[PDB]
Amino acid sequence: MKGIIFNVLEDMVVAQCGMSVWNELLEKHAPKDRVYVSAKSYAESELFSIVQDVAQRLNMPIQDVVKAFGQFLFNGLASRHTDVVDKFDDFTSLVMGIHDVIHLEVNKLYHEPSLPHINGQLLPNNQIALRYSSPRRLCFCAEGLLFGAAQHFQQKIQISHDTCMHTGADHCMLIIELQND
Ligand code: HEM
Secondary structure, eight states: OOOHHHHHHHHHHHHHTOHHHHHHHHHHHOOSSOOOOSSOOTTTTHHHHHHHHHHHHTTOOHHHHHHHHHHHHHHHHHHHHHHHHGGGSSHHHHHTTIIIIIHHHHHHHSSOSOOOEEEEEEOSSSEEEEEEEOTTOOHHHHHHHHHHHHHHTTOOEEEEEEEOGGGTOSSEEEEEEEOOO
């Protein structure tokens, strides 16, 4: 009933340094309200400030922290939306269903028509072309999410990101190759 994203995160930090670290940097970087709502979208920037700081104390690079954060975010989320996710029965069905159902249901349940831009297209040889674009330029997170869902189903995959809005590009290009080993 309070910030779904922050809820799954609190579980991650608690596993790294404990709840004291989460409450410490949270109270320092928290606003006047001092509350994280999942239905709202305000004070959402605090997540970024928390990801870079938590990385400092945890002694980790922000690029790795944001990634790991995603992998786990998917795990916890699935447990809350197992109904929506389970509609894929397999990593292949989800990647292409991301924007589609997964982001269409959360919109009605929370937030409002303004979710990142994701276009999954199926290719041959068991490959999937996933396009990503959004000012948040938090693509680094999208990668982690893809790996989190893959592992959850003992499914190994590889992602090639040559196009990144972070490199002046207007969008991004993430190709997820599926292993048939
Ligand atoms: C691997 C699968 C997924 C991908 C690649 C994906 C990707 C993204 C990305 C990267 C964001 C973070 C904002 C940003 O783009 O910078 C986003 C936002 C969001 N996604 Fe997903 N998503 C996935 C699965 C899901 C699932 C399963 C749900 C439902 C539980 C979901 C719920 C959300 C929510 C709630 C937001 C909005 C965050 C906000 O604006 O406060 N997504 N998604």
